[PDB]
Amino acid sequence: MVPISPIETVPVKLKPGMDGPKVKQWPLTEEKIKALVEICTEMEKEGKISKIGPENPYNTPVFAIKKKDSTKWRKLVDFRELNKRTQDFWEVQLGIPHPAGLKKKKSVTVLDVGDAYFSVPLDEDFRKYTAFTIPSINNETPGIRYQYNVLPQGWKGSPAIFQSSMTKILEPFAAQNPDIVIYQYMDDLYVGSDLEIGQHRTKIEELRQHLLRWGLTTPDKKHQKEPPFLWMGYELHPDKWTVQPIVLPEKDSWTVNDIQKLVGKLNWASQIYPGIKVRQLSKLLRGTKALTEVIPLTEEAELELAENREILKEPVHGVYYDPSKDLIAEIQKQGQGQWTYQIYQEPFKNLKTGKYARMRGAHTNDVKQLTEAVQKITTESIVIWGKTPKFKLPIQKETWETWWTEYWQATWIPEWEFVNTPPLVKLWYQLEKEPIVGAETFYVDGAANRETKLGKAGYVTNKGRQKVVPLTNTTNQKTELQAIYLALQDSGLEVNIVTDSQYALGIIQAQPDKSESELVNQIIEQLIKKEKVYLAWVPAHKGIGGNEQVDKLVSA
Amino acid sequence: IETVPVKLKPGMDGPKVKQWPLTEEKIKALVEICTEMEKEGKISKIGPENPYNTPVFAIKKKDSTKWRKLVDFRELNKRTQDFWEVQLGIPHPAGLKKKKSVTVLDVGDAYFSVPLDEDFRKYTAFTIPSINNETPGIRYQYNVLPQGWKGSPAIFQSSMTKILEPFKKQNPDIVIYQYMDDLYVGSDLEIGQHRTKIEELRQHLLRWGLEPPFLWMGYELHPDKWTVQPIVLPEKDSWTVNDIQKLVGKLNWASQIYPGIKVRQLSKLLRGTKALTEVIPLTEEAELELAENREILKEPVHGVYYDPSKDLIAEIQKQGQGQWTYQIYQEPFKNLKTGKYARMRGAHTNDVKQLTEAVQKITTESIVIWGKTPKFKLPIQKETWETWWTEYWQATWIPEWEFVNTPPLVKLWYQ
Numbered sequence: 001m002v003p004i005s006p007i008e009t010v011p012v013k014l015k016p017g018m019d020g021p022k023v024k025q026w027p028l029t030e031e032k033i034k035a036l037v038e039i040c041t042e043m044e045k046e047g048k049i050s051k052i053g054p055e056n057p058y059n060t061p062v063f064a065i066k067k068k069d070s071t072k073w074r075k076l077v078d079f080r081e082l083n084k085r086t087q088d089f090w091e092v093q094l095g096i097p098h099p100a101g102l103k104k105k106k107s108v109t110v111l112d113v114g115d116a117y118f119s120v121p122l123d124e125d126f127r128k129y130t131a132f133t134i135p136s137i138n139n140e141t142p143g144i145r146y147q148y149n150v151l152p153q154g155w156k157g158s159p160a161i162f163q164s165s166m167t168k169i170l171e172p173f174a175a176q177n178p179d180i181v182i183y184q185y186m187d188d189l190y191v192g193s194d195l196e197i198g199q200h201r202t203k204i205e206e207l208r209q210h211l212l213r214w215g216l217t218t219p220d221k222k223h224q225k226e227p228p229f230l231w232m233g234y235e236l237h238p239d240k241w242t243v244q245p246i247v248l249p250e251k252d253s254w255t256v257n258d259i260q261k262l263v264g265k266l267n268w269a270s271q272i273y274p275g276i277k278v279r280q281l282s283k284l285l286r287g288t289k290a291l292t293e294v295i296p297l298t299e300e301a302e303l304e305l306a307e308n309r310e311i312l313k314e315p316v317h318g319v320y321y322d323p324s325k326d327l328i329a330e331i332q333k334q335g336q337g338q339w340t341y342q343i344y345q346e347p348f349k350n351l352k353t354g355k356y357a358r359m360r361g362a363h364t365n366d367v368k369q370l371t372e373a374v375q376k377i378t379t380e381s382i383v384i385w386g387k388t389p390k391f392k393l394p395i396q397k398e399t400w401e402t403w404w405t406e407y408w409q410a411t412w413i414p415e416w417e418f419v420n421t422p423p424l425v426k427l428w429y430q431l432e433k434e435p436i437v438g439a440e441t442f443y444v445d446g447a448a449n450r451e452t453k454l455g456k457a458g459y460v461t462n463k464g465r466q467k468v469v470p471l472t473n474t475t476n477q478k479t480e481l482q483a484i485y486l487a488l489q490d491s492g493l494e495v496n497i498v499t500d501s502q503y504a505l506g507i508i509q510a511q512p513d514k515s516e517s518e519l520v521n522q523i524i525e526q527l528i529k530k531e532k533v534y535l536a537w538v539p540a541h542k543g544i545g546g547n548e549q550v551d552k553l554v555s556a
Numbered sequence: 557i558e559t560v561p562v563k564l565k566p567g568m569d570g571p572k573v574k575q576w577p578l579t580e581e582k583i584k585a586l587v588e589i590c591t592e593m594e595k596e597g598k599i600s601k602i603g604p605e606n607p608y609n610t611p612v613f614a615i616k617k618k619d620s621t622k623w624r625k626l627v628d629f630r631e632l633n634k635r636t637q638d639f640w641e642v643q644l645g646i647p648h649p650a651g652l653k654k655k656k657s658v659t660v661l662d663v664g665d666a667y668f669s670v671p672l673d674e675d676f677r678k679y680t681a682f683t684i685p686s687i688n689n690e691t692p693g694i695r696y697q698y699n700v701l702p703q704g705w706k707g708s709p710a711i712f713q714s715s716m717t718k719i720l721e722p723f724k725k726q727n728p729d730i731v732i733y734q735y736m737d738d739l740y741v742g743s744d745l746e747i748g749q750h751r752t753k754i755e756e757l758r759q760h761l762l763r764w765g766l767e768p769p770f771l772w773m774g775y776e777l778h779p780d781k782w783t784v785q786p787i788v789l790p791e792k793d794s795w796t797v798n799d800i801q802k803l804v805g806k807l808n809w810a811s812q813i814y815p816g817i818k819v820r821q822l823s824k825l826l827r828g829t830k831a832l833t834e835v836i837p838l839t840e841e842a843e844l845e846l847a848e849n850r851e852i853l854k855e856p857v858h859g860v861y862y863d864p865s866k867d868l869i870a871e872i873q874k875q876g877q878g879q880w881t882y883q884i885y886q887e888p889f890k891n892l893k894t895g896k897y898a899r900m901r902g903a904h905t906n907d908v909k910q911l912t913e914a915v916q917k918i919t920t921e922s923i924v925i926w927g928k929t930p931k932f933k934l935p936i937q938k939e940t941w942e943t944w945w946t947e948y949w950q951a952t953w954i955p956e957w958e959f960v961n962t963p964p965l966v967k968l969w970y971q
């Protein structure tokens with residue numbers, strides 16, 4: 001024989017303080033027992049399981065299931081209890097490769113490594129915890145006791161310990177063959193390269209020789225799977241990729257669950273289909289989670305669905321990554337807090353697409369949203385390609401400079417260039433830094449009784465202009481905004497406004513262009529129509545003229 | 557060479573912190589660094605039975621072309637036992653902040669000479685990720701004292717004091733302080749002199765070493781020229797209504813810090829409903845109240861004390877024009893230090909780089925004065941900060957931070 005190098009064992013422990021499982025073996029029919037005995041005898045013949053004495057106190061239940069439409073029986077060892085007691089492992093599969101980060105390959109061969117999976121040795125000191133019992137015929141003899149010597153399917157550590165063992169076996173080959181890529185998915189190895197088919201097929205042979213050093217045999221009759229590959233919801237081709245077919249169903253009535261699965265498909269599709277939108281359809285699942293409830297689709301949501309159907313009419317494909325070229329990312333504003341983007345290297349050949357949605361917030365503006373989208377694409381691009389793309393953004397360079405220099409927070413967007421494709425992001429208003437000479441000065445105030453919710457809002461000005469409005473179902477905070485609104489409504493194109501509302505200044509200092517509050521929205525509308533607005537803050541109840549007069553008018 | 561036993565704190569597991577995305581250039585740098593650390597025995601590859609993780613990235617220290625590996629041990633440092641065995645804690649030298657010159661040296665390479673308790677190594681696990689997760693991340697753990705771990709200076713303390721004994725006996729007026737991987741060396745000498753004693757000090761550890769990649773560097777400070785920000789009020793010959801409104805606002809704010817501040821006579825000038833740009837003459841009662849407020853503001857704040865058992869808090873405001881103001885305190889309105897920057901380096905068009913440099917300078921200031929780092933309240937959205945701060949970081953430690961999402965009115969009063 002040819003000496004084989006052994007697979008080193010990973011030391012395994014149970015969670016601290018936890019002992020092994022001691023689960024009762026459920027009664028089985030005489031026909032399932034004889035099926036399990038034959039199955040386990042052959043597993044024993046192959047070195048997978050070994051019979052144990054009666055000293056081992058642990059046990060895990062075993063079942064017999066009929067492979068349907070077959071007289072064949074299949075074994076199921078239910079390790080649910082042992083898994084709860086087994087330590088946590090490092091999981092490498094958590095990050096899945098994105099197809100848009102892959103490279104073009106001329107050839108991709110698949111090798112079956114199932115031989116290796118069911119043949120990775122298990123830590124000798126952990127085997128006892130995998131004990132199970134075949135019941136005896138008529139319970140007149142002791143059940144047959146066995147323990148695993150290999151990695152048990154359904155055990156918590158089997159996927160991680162298999163991947164780590166395979167990776168360690170392959171690392172020397174990969175390092176010394178930098179002309180190929182190797183990827184392990186389930187019990188298959190995928191080997192890709194750009195070599196001529198003969199040079200490539202030699203590498204595969206060489207990889208088979210390397211694997212034989214650990215006794216790992218690969219089927220000679222080469223795999224049936226061939227490009228395209230159906231994987232993690234994608235279609236992988238040699239020189240392009242896409243998502244598996246996206247079919248939006250026809251439905252006369254839509255239910256909560258149906259909308260959730262519609263949005264899920266749209267989200268999945270949005271990574272290569274440009275312009276997918278889901279705002280109005282997601283609005284339908286606000287707050288409610290009764291899967292069986294029917295929600296009438298609003299006109300807005302029917303339009304969004306109709307728009308999505310026409311985007312999904314025909315297949316779209318992405319190209320793979322060419323490291324020798326820059327990455328470009330282009331963003332468009334879609335409305336109602338929705339943003340879409342495309343990442344490409346040569347014009348009209350997208351690597352991938354995507355979308356970003358306005359975060360939940362009382363107030364917002366387009367510049368902040370555009371900034372957040374840039375950060376998201378930047379982070380996604382670091383993951384997929386390891387570098388930041390150059391950005392093409394629908395915002396003038398002058399608009400960005402004015403926003404960043406004057407915004408109270410630090411903010412930054414990476415290298416970018418203006419792309420003149422409406423709708424453009426712009427600043428809708430900008431407050432003055434100094435008081436305006438010649439502009440009327442409005443001293444505003446409001447107040448509300450906390451019991452009755454009755455209040456007043458108003459102003460007094462240096463020209464003797466005055467207004468007080470009685471209000472119902474209001475609050476101090478609402479009356480303070482109403483006062484500012486009244487001053488804007490009644491003033492000319494240039495106005496100085498003096499408020500004592502820290503609340504109102506916090507909001508306006510945040511420079512919103514749309515809000516949850518229709519009152520803030522009315523204020524924004526008024527600000528947009530002014531030429532110059534200076535907003536001044538003073539502390540309340542300090543004898544400041546103007547502010548003192550109107551405070552007493554409104555808190556009466 | 558015999559390991560000190562190290563434990564986590566009671567009822568506390570090891571860190572399980574996700575590795576954040578790394579650029580291609582940082583990955584390739586870390587692969588090269590870790591390959592040569594592995595050959596030198598400093599780290600070893602680990603298996604899947606180790607589920608712990610601490611994030612890693614790479615930086616370029618101030619004025620260096622060579623990548624430095626930086627592990628973010630913030631979580632492990634929180635969960636690591638406190639080291640009060642041999643010393644309840646070296647008392648923090650209050651004289652360091654009073655020297656004319658303080659040079660900071662990276663002595664972290666010395667830690668690699670001491671083995672790490674073999675039962676604790678698992679908790680130092682880290683991962684070198686691959687672009688697009690196309691290959692399994694490279695998993696390592698430390699066999700020696702890691703840089704950035706709070707236990708490294710503690711375990712190496714005994715060794716450091718003996719290395720430095722000949723230099724300390726020959727130079728008794730020098731104050732030497734160790735924080736994490738940094739050595740702060742303060743003197744009152746002429747800088748030409750100063751640089752030569754620093755070079756003398758570097759030799760002691762090359763001698764003992766017999767190579768450290770960054771020991772040759774020197775970050776020179778001058779804590780005796782450090783400036784502070786008292787509250788100052790404008791001196792004007794013509795006060796507009798708006799000017800007086802801003803004055804009364806600022807004085808009202810100051811009255812939370814200083815008891816005897818008054819604004820009654822100044823408010824009295826506003827009587828009526830006047831245009832914001834109208835000039836108001838000060839009456840003599842307002843001028844006196846204002847003068848009395850000026851003299852209050854020249855005295856220290858009452859009841860301000862440092863407590864080493866409480867967190868330091870650092871707030872920063874963007875003032876524009878590359879200018880930043882900051883305050884360090886433990887209790888509201890009881891500032892222990894205030895300051896202002898404008899010299900932020902190579903960042904005239906990058907606010908986030910400026911802020912990152914300000915955070916580092918403030919943290920350095922805090923280390924020198926109190927021997928620990930403050931918790932920052934940063935005027936930035938978390939997503940913007942988290943995406944970029946690592947690109948401008950040049951220190952070997954990392955403080956804690958939270959995000960300010962509502963604009964503070966106090967910005968006006970510190971400008």
Ligand SMILES: Cc1cc(/C=C/C#N)cc(C)c1Nc1ccnc(Nc2ccc(C#N)cc2)n1
Nearest residue numbers: 097102103105183190192227229231236237238
């Ligand atoms: C992640 C991955 C999944 C599969 C397959 C999983 C499955 N099922 C196959 C391979 C070889 C890889 N690994 C890599 C690594 C770098 N570039 C590529 N490019 C690449 C991959 C497949 C096709 C095709 N057809 C074309 C190019 N693949």
Ligand SMILES: Oc1ccc(Br)cc1
Nearest residue numbers: 116162165166169214
């Ligand atoms: O020979 C081997 C079989 C399986 C693995 Br996983 C690693 C090596």
Ligand SMILES: [Mg+2]
Nearest residue numbers: 445446540551
């Ligand atoms: Mg009031």
